[PDB]
Each structure stands twice: as C-alpha cells, then as structure tokens.
Design an enzyme around this catalytic site. Structure first.
Site, PDB file in Angstrom:
ATOM      1  N   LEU A  42      41.197  31.960  42.038  1.00  0.00           N
ATOM      2  CA  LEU A  42      41.760  33.128  42.715  1.00  0.00           C
ATOM      3  C   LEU A  42      41.280  34.482  42.179  1.00  0.00           C
ATOM      4  O   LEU A  42      40.613  35.247  42.891  1.00  0.00           O
ATOM      5  CB  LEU A  42      43.289  33.068  42.664  1.00  0.00           C
ATOM      6  CG  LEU A  42      43.898  31.841  43.349  1.00  0.00           C
ATOM      7  CD1 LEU A  42      45.411  31.967  43.418  1.00  0.00           C
ATOM      8  CD2 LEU A  42      43.327  31.718  44.753  1.00  0.00           C
ATOM      9  N   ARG A  44      39.708  37.107  38.830  1.00  0.00           N
ATOM     10  CA  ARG A  44      38.705  37.212  37.763  1.00  0.00           C
ATOM     11  C   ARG A  44      38.967  38.616  37.257  1.00  0.00           C
ATOM     12  O   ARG A  44      38.246  39.558  37.565  1.00  0.00           O
ATOM     13  CB  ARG A  44      37.309  37.057  38.384  1.00  0.00           C
ATOM     14  CG  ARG A  44      36.235  36.411  37.480  1.00  0.00           C
ATOM     15  CD  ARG A  44      35.673  37.366  36.450  1.00  0.00           C
ATOM     16  NE  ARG A  44      35.508  36.730  35.139  1.00  0.00           N
ATOM     17  CZ  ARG A  44      34.341  36.342  34.614  1.00  0.00           C
ATOM     18  NH1 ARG A  44      33.199  36.510  35.284  1.00  0.00           N
ATOM     19  NH2 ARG A  44      34.311  35.813  33.391  1.00  0.00           N
ATOM     20  N   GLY A  45      40.052  38.726  36.495  1.00  0.00           N
ATOM     21  CA  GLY A  45      40.508  40.005  35.987  1.00  0.00           C
ATOM     22  C   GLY A  45      39.768  40.731  34.888  1.00  0.00           C
ATOM     23  O   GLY A  45      40.188  41.830  34.522  1.00  0.00           O
ATOM     24  N   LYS A  46      38.680  40.161  34.373  1.00  0.00           N
ATOM     25  CA  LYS A  46      37.952  40.825  33.298  1.00  0.00           C
ATOM     26  C   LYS A  46      38.827  40.860  32.037  1.00  0.00           C
ATOM     27  O   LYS A  46      38.483  41.488  31.034  1.00  0.00           O
ATOM     28  CB  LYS A  46      37.588  42.246  33.739  1.00  0.00           C
ATOM     29  CG  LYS A  46      36.830  42.355  35.061  1.00  0.00           C
ATOM     30  CD  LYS A  46      35.621  41.429  35.087  1.00  0.00           C
ATOM     31  CE  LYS A  46      34.580  41.823  34.044  1.00  0.00           C
ATOM     32  NZ  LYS A  46      34.111  43.223  34.256  1.00  0.00           N
ATOM     33  N   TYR A  47      39.968  40.185  32.112  1.00  0.00           N
ATOM     34  CA  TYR A  47      40.874  40.092  30.980  1.00  0.00           C
ATOM     35  C   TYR A  47      41.445  38.694  31.021  1.00  0.00           C
ATOM     36  O   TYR A  47      42.078  38.219  30.084  1.00  0.00           O
ATOM     37  CB  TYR A  47      41.991  41.122  31.081  1.00  0.00           C
ATOM     38  CG  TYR A  47      41.883  42.219  30.040  1.00  0.00           C
ATOM     39  CD1 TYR A  47      42.130  41.965  28.685  1.00  0.00           C
ATOM     40  CD2 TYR A  47      41.497  43.504  30.407  1.00  0.00           C
ATOM     41  CE1 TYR A  47      41.993  42.969  27.726  1.00  0.00           C
ATOM     42  CE2 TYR A  47      41.355  44.513  29.457  1.00  0.00           C
ATOM     43  CZ  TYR A  47      41.609  44.240  28.119  1.00  0.00           C
ATOM     44  OH  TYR A  47      41.532  45.250  27.183  1.00  0.00           O
ATOM     45  N   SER A  48      41.196  38.035  32.137  1.00  0.00           N
ATOM     46  CA  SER A  48      41.660  36.698  32.338  1.00  0.00           C
ATOM     47  C   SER A  48      40.939  36.143  33.569  1.00  0.00           C
ATOM     48  O   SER A  48      40.170  36.827  34.248  1.00  0.00           O
ATOM     49  CB  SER A  48      43.148  36.732  32.616  1.00  0.00           C
ATOM     50  OG  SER A  48      43.386  37.635  33.690  1.00  0.00           O
ATOM     51  N   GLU A  49      41.197  34.877  33.838  1.00  0.00           N
ATOM     52  CA  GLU A  49      40.658  34.167  34.981  1.00  0.00           C
ATOM     53  C   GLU A  49      41.856  33.433  35.563  1.00  0.00           C
ATOM     54  O   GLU A  49      42.596  32.770  34.845  1.00  0.00           O
ATOM     55  CB  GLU A  49      39.534  33.211  34.553  1.00  0.00           C
ATOM     56  CG  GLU A  49      39.849  32.392  33.313  1.00  0.00           C
ATOM     57  CD  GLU A  49      38.671  32.266  32.344  1.00  0.00           C
ATOM     58  OE1 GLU A  49      37.701  31.548  32.670  1.00  0.00           O
ATOM     59  OE2 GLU A  49      38.718  32.884  31.253  1.00  0.00           O
ATOM     60  N   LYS A  65      46.418  30.900  34.387  1.00  0.00           N
ATOM     61  CA  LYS A  65      45.760  32.110  33.976  1.00  0.00           C
ATOM     62  C   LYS A  65      45.147  31.789  32.634  1.00  0.00           C
ATOM     63  O   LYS A  65      45.855  31.649  31.636  1.00  0.00           O
ATOM     64  CB  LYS A  65      46.790  33.236  33.845  1.00  0.00           C
ATOM     65  CG  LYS A  65      46.224  34.615  33.519  1.00  0.00           C
ATOM     66  CD  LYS A  65      47.283  35.664  33.792  1.00  0.00           C
ATOM     67  CE  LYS A  65      46.888  37.058  33.343  1.00  0.00           C
ATOM     68  NZ  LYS A  65      47.976  38.055  33.613  1.00  0.00           N
ATOM     69  N   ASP A 153      52.217  48.603  34.225  1.00  0.00           N
ATOM     70  CA  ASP A 153      51.099  48.343  35.116  1.00  0.00           C
ATOM     71  C   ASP A 153      51.614  48.033  36.512  1.00  0.00           C
ATOM     72  O   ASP A 153      51.123  47.127  37.182  1.00  0.00           O
ATOM     73  CB  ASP A 153      50.254  47.186  34.582  1.00  0.00           C
ATOM     74  CG  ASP A 153      48.873  47.134  35.214  1.00  0.00           C
ATOM     75  OD1 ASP A 153      48.325  48.218  35.526  1.00  0.00           O
ATOM     76  OD2 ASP A 153      48.332  46.016  35.385  1.00  0.00           O
TER      77      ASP A 153
END
Length: 326
Positions: A42, A44-49, A65, A153
């Site tokens: 789903l 690809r947060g650049k801090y998580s996947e 996550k 956030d």
C-alpha cells in the site's frame, strides 16, 4: 523567549508511572511473524513500508507497517504510544508486533479499515458528513490528549475512513510525542500545509493545541473546498500564506507576547496584511457547507496564539455539532 504551558492535561504525564512515558526503557513483547502473509503493497512512507496482509490464524485482513531502520528510539516511542492508546475512540488499534525476516526491523500489524482517498472523498461530503466526521476526529484527539499525547501530524492522509460503515481511524503515530510542561520540542513535525504558527515561528514550547490548528486547516479546506487552504511553496512562504488570511497585526501580537523574534528573511517577504473576513472565501460552489456556526468554530481553531485555540473538548461542545445525532 517567554515560556508557556498547556491549559488542559497539563501534568497528566508528570503524575503517571515512569514506565508510562519513558519509551526508551520499554521492552517489546514480540509475536510470531509466521502468522502474517503479505498481500500487495500500500504505502512507501520513506519512514516505513505499508502492506495489506492476512492473519492466517483466522484469515483476517491486517495492515503491516515495516519500519525503516531510522533510530530504535523513534520506533519504540511509537509502539509505546500505540499501546497506551490501545482501545481509545477511533484510534487505530495495534494488534501485534513481529520482527520482519528480510528487513530485520519491527513490523507493526494493525486492524483493517477500508479508506478511499481523501482527494476524491472529502469533496463529496455533505455539510452533515463534515460535521459528523469532524466530531469523530475530535473524539480521537481528546482521548490521546487526555492521555498526555500529541499526534503532531494531523492531516487528511492520516485519517482512514470507511464511509459505508461511517467509521474513522486516526493513524500514523510515528511523530506522536508525550507532553511534559516546559519541555521544548522539535518544530520539524507535521506537513507544510498543517503546520501551526508556533512551528513556523520556531517556538519549541508547544502542546496539544498544535493538533487543533491542523484540525482547523482540514476543516477550512472541507467547507471552503480549497485544498489545501494554506498553500505554501515552502515553510517560510507557508507563514506568509497564513498572514494573508489572519493578517500580520495578530502575528506580531503573537510573537511579541512570547517575545519571539522572526528571523530576518521573514522580514522582506512578509509585508502588511489586514485580517480578512471568511465570507470572502465563501462563493457559489461551497456556500451549502458554510453556516455562521461553521465560521465561528473555524475562527476559534485558527488563531496564531496557541493558548487561545479551542481545546479538543471545548470543540466538541460547540453549536456546530448540535446537528450531529447520536
């Protein structure tokens, strides 16, 4: 640099056990990684996947996550926060925590909500739906704040909605933090469009009211149908965007009150802007979403002074929600 404190849930953490807020000394009770089978990918947060998976123990949907390896300290801060808010109103619920074989980092497994993108969704919300869902977000905020936690956030992307079942879930607590009176926090939280003036003016002693400004930002875009409402090109221009709406007089009053001094660049791009009345943001296409109570409510959320903003609970007492059923 005048100090400030939260006017509510001021010392909720100060009285609680140390094991409650000290996430650094927290011990993660891991579960069995073999119970989850990943299906597609789903986020690809650049801090998580983020992946959609299935708990093969009961063949039920879950969201995993897998966190990127950036600092055991940010990962157990999130885990402790999620466990403290486990079972809170409209708070995403953490179901398990396993170790990923491949990444070797922690994998958080959550329940499952069926959200349809907010860019196609909340421009399809009726005046009634807006009040309804706003009330649900407010339940989530009051709960985490009453638990001594700041989300930091808040935006349309961290709000999962199942319109059919009319369910809401505040997610992504990677930036969440515990509130301690007098504590100075990093101003690098939130997304540009939802950053409060405190964050933009470099004032580190903020509190729960930060989430309230971001909530005001989301409301403004829903009722005026302007996404995002404060559209800055960068963090400096973000403040100028806000000043073109709230005006510069109230901005100086705010910075003066706390004895904050803007940095030089903020002084050859800011200019002089009078506060504009929000009927000017009202037109033919958004009219049906605006009412005197909506404007009054919005007005109390969007204030430079973080101490003057409605608290989450006060916000739930506003006439604006008198129409929302039970």
């Amino acid at each position: 640099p005048v100090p400030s404190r939260a006017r509510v849930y001021t010392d909720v953490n100060t009285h609680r056990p140390r094991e409650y807020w000290d996430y650094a000394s927290h011990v993660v009770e891991w579960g069995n990684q073999d119970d989850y089978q990943l299906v597609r990918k789903l986020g690809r947060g650049k801090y998580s996947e983020v992946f959609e998976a299935i708990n093969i123990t009961n063949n039920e949907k879950v969201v995993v996550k897998i966190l990127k390896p950036v600092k055991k300290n940010k990962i157990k801060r999130e885990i402790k926060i999620l466990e403290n808010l486990r079972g809170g109103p409209n708070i995403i619920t953490l179901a398990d925590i396993v170790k990923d074989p491949v990444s070797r980092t922690p994998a958080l497994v959550f329940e499952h909500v069926n959200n349809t993108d907010f860019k196609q969704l909340y421009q399809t919300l009726t005046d009634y739906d807006i009040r309804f869902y706003m009330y649900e977000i407010l339940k989530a905020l009051d709960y985490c704040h009453s638990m001594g936690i700041m989300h930091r956030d808040v935006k349309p992307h961290n709000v999962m909605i199942d319109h059919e079942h009319r369910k809401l879930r505040l997610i992504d607590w990677g930036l969440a933090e515990f509130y301690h009176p007098g504590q100075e926090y990093n101003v690098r939280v939130a997304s540009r469009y939802f950053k409060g003036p405190e964050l933009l003016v470099d004032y580190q002693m903020y509190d729960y009211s930060l989430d309230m400004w971001s909530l005001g930002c989301m409301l403004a875009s829903m009722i005026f149908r302007k996404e995002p409402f404060f559209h800055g090109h960068d963090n400096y221009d973000q403040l100028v965007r806000i000043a073109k709406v709230l005006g510069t007089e109230d901005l100086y009053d705010y910075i003066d009150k706390y004895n904050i001094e803007l940095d030089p660049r903020f002084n050859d791009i800011l200019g002089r802007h009078s506060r504009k009345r929000w009927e000017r943001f009202v037109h033919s296409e958004n009219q049906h979403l605006v009412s005197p109570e909506a404007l009054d409510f919005l007005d109390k959320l969007l204030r430079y002074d973080h101490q003057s903003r409605l608290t989450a609970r006060e916000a739930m007492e506003h006439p604006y929600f008198y129409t929302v059923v039970k």
